[PDB]
Amino acid sequence: HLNSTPVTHCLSDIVKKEDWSDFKFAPIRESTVSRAMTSRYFKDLDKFAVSDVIIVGAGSSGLSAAYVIAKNRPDLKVCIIESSVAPGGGSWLGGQLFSAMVMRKPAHLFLQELEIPYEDEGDYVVVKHAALFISTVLSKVLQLPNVKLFNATCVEDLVTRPPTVTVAGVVTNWTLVTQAHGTQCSMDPNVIELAGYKNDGTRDLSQKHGVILSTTGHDGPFGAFCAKRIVDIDQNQKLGGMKGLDMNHAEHDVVIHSGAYAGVDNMYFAGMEVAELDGLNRMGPTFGAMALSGVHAAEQILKHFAA
Amino acid sequence: HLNSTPVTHCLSDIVKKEDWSDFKFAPIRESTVSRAMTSRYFKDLDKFAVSDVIIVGAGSSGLSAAYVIAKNRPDLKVCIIESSVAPGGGSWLGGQLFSAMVMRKPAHLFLQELEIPYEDEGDYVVVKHAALFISTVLSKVLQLPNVKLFNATCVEDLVTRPPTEKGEVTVAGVVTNWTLVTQAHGTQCSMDPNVIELAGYKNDGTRDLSQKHGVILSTTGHDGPFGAFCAKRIVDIDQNQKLGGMKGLDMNHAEHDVVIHSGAYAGVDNMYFAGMEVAELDGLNRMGPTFGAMALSGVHAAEQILKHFAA
Amino acid sequence: HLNSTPVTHCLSDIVKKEDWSDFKFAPIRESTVSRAMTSRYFKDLDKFAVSDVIIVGAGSSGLSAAYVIAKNRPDLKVCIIESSVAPGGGSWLGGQLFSAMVMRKPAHLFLQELEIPYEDEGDYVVVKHAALFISTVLSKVLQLPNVKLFNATCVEDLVTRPPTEKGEVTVAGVVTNWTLVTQAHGTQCSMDPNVIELAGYKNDGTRDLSQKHGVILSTTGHDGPFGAFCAKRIVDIDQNQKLGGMKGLDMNHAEHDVVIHSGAYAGVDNMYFAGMEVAELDGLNRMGPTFGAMALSGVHAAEQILKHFAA
Amino acid sequence: HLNSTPVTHCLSDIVKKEDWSDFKFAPIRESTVSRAMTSRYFKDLDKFAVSDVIIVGAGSSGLSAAYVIAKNRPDLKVCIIESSVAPGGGSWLGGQLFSAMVMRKPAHLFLQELEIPYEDEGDYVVVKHAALFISTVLSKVLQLPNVKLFNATCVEDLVTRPPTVTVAGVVTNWTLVTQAHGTQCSMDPNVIELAGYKNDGTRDLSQKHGVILSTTGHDGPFGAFCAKRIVDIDQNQKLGGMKGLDMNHAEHDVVIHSGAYAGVDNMYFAGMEVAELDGLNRMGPTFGAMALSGVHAAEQILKHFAA
């Protein structure tokens, strides 16, 4: 008998009729709803048109890095650009459409920080659904005051300045526009700029320069975007190409190699995009390196802004 | 001067080299990882092959109902089947790809329960990103001990028993497959489905009156590749029942009617509906980019389901 | 000897080097450009969230009506919603990809008003390219102070209120999205729509009798990915109203009947139609590659709308 | 009360019944309409089968150049070939499906010439809809006596003569034919020839040679067509490839580099096609360089024909 406790919910003391006939919403006008949404979105577009940190790709590595950066420095404008409608990338499932998420120690310390429960198996731990990890990190990241998630939005190119570096921003559009198609062309893009420039477009050496962190995963549909674009622009930079699966070497190397990119200033990488760029092994259905590679890139970025 | 505070993270005291050269994972072999995942998934398939509550569609209405049911009764096996890889349905955005989520009072009381922050505007409140609502409910629902999310899995039919107790259609489970299989035009066919059964039957397949019968709650919305799935399937089988068909947009009438009409379906026993699927079934107005009725319609269906299991 | 005249252009007196090496733009930063565009677009979305006239479809009939309405009443908020990136509909060509545009008299009087040149052939006149007609009307309409063109945006439903004043369907606005979203099979769903409201309602959503009610004019043609949109949606909601269905081609009867039948729709209040959508709704003949009825049907609808707003 | 002025339109004094029952068209026969259209189209195909200026692509740069050329020299046969049904290219919208069109000074002088209204913001001006710019230029260009717009028509190749140059015309088809597909093949093309040749196909050195201006935008679906084709034919000519976004450098360089192409005689370029050919930066949602690069190419072409 547990079936004898009371049925309780948020309206239990206000809705008294069995048929809910005494339920009512406060009244509304359709234009009030429209203006409430549009006003807030334009405020976001105005505020983040110059950003301190631009993160490309809201998968496990990008969101892990966003958490660490924003928690440490709540004053910094952190702009997260995600091409899909749903954020989270490949972290809604384990392998072969199965659920469980394996993370090798010491990645369990990140789970403890986020208060995510797990089963301890000795050298590794298991979160009972990959979806529990990614939804928890999302809930926490999005609550922060200067974080913005621009979902359904795709990076199409980089904003640059002349040689020796730099990146100076990203070129953006609705994903469905970029993926179009048969429709009348053109449909021009928008731009988001990094902190550090004057109104005449030149560098202000007195101001701390913004950074880009690319975490778009390995090569594919929208995959390894910033790695390929840097390699395309620069003749002496070549794409390593992701190698075969080897869990010991892949997870180690992805964590170690994450962070600042050597050939371009103010440019950072984490997650499987690093494996494409640097020619590292893949790891398949294990997730500790994705979280911890985000942690490593976040440390390097935070040190840049500390001065 | 926030820039003077320490750079700290979960590995700050164990990783001491600037270049992270002293970082190390514990060792592993590939088969250990495979077996860790497969063993747990087939334990889920075994355990939930008979379920107490089957929820079809993990959108705002379905997940809101899952929260209320599971929190109230942690003993019941609650099986959530979602066709997409990412759960959440239409709740990752507001309208026209914009972000803010408007909820009319008294839906703010549900946000207070979930500890979701909002801006109070008088007769309504605003959550700063729709994604904050849906990820918060997901995080809380999935932590519960007898809840399972079968994502990338679709419902393609109902399991039934013969007419009346009372009504034409009598529900006893759902017919399932990987979503990509159901959508697979047109490789070698067939690829047969699997089945998940409701509580209440003997090993010979007949009703066991000493057990409380399980229930289905369908929350598949009004549209998409599927959408209004269980509404259309009941209407198809039962020749004396037709789809009302969703009408034009009218927020005052839509939100009221969707909340009130949610719950038990008359004509089929042990069958419940919430969210925009109710508007398709009962011929109600739509509401567009406002979300209070989705959450509160899930709450109403959950109340009726919880009362079924109380006695 | 035209080849002896001077080569002159807008920069002839300021750019003096043969190689243009002394040419210079004023300096700029990328965020200045972004903010200049976004600030203006959200001002449009705020201002037109309540509109006096909503015109659905920017083809020859819709733009002709827009011209007459806005020129007569420059105070009214006229909101033009067009699904394609380029406005103009079927008026960029004549028939079979050929160019010339034939207009039967007295449609030449509309061309005279717009100062569009033509060849007089007696009972009809010819504009040398259909593209000259449509680009001229566009240039003039868009200059007007309270006209807004929302291109790349589609209407996917009607905003309604409950039956009779009098008739089954009562219009109060339109439901909108980016065209590419509405057509998006089959990414994560939902992606919710937005709404644009007609003048005449209080903040509690009820009719305000002290204000003139806004109107919708649908001019979406007979075909295409959408097409005859509002005709089909009214017919779908109202079970006692059916589509006439467009008949065979007959120029004498089609052009006459389309002009006369344009204007207020009986059965729905504050709802108007023009162009080939009228032929679908009322079961009229088609006319093919002749354009006088498209322009003049817009003029007739505009007269009826202007009379509504006069008192 | 503005609602008290009269309701007036072009038929107000001729249509007297409230129900429009006294409205009538002059009568017609279906074959009269058909013959009116076909006769005029064949006259165009006959007249422009030899042309003085062939402009490929009716976007902002191509139409701006057409305006300047035709206004200065109304005697020259200017043949505009556009693959889409609607001309205008990417100039129906600003960026990210938004409307406003930003043009940096001194591009405002071109707007003044065309009588297009704008908001002055100091170093730049704003046209309230990109659609107002492009429809105004279209209306004015099309009224000119020796200009022809062949829309729904695609350039598939160049007509050439043997090495040292030249281009001698273009190879054309309906766009839907070129894009086909599964249908029976072949469907052969047509040709449009440049002024300057004799009836035996050889150069007439006494006559002024026609020119091609290619303005097909940057690489894509139908993008950068003539740039790629020249590079394909010539082994020692390579495609620069468009670089990252940088508004200061892109707009300057696109204007300066527009005009005559160095490796081929009687060949000219403007707009974003120049950025692909010469490896220049892109500029995104700003439009001054498109108009003014058209102006520069027009100056060079007009000087060729002045003799």
UniProtKB/Swiss-Prot annotation, chains B, C:
Recorded GO MF terms: cysteine-dependent adenosine diphosphate thiazole synthase activity; ferrous iron binding; iron ion binding
Subunit note: Homooctamer; tetramer of dimers.
Cofactor note (record): Binds 1 Fe cation per subunit.
Keywords: Cytoplasm, Iron, Metal-binding, NAD, Nucleus, Thiamine biosynthesis, Transferase
Enzyme class of the recorded protein, top EC level: transferase
Gene3D superfamilies, A to Z: 6.10.250.2840, FAD/NAD(P)-binding domain (3.50.50.60)
Source species of the chain: Saccharomyces cerevisiae (strain ATCC 204508 / S288c) (Baker's yeast)
Any Pfam family hit: Thi4
Positions bearing 2,3-didehydroalanine (Cys): S190
UniProt: substrate binding residues: S61, E82, S83, G90, V155, D192, H222, M276, R286, M287, G288
Note: Expressed at high levels in the early stationary phase of batch cultures growing on molasses, an industrial medium.
GO biological process: one example: mitochondrial genome maintenance
Protein name per Swiss-Prot or TrEMBL: Thiamine thiazole synthase
Predominant place of localization: cytoplasm
Role of this protein: Involved in biosynthesis of the thiamine precursor thiazole. Catalyzes the conversion of NAD and glycine to adenosine diphosphate 5-(2-hydroxyethyl)-4-methylthiazole-2-carboxylic acid (ADT), an adenylated thiazole intermediate. The reaction includes an iron-dependent sulfide transfer from a conserved cysteine residue of the protein to a thiazole intermediate. The enzyme can only undergo a single turnover, which suggests it is a suicide enzyme. May have additional roles in adaptation to various stress conditions and in DNA damage tolerance.
A GO cellular-component term linked to this record: cytosol
Cofactor(s) for this UniProt protein: Fe cation
Catalyzed reactions: [ADP-thiazole synthase]-L-cysteine + glycine + NAD(+) = [ADP-thiazole synthase]-dehydroalanine + ADP-5-ethyl-4-methylthiazole-2-carboxylate + nicotinamide + 3 H2O + 2 H(+)
PANTHER family linked to this entry: THIAMINE THIAZOLE SYNTHASE (PTHR43422:SF3)
Compartment(s): Cytoplasm; Nucleus
Enzyme Commission (EC) number: 2.4.2.60
Similarity remark: Belongs to the THI4 family.
Induction: Repressed by thiamine.
Tree of life domain: Eukaryota
Result of altering H185N: Partially active, trapping the enzyme at an advanced intermediate, just before the sulfide transfer reaction
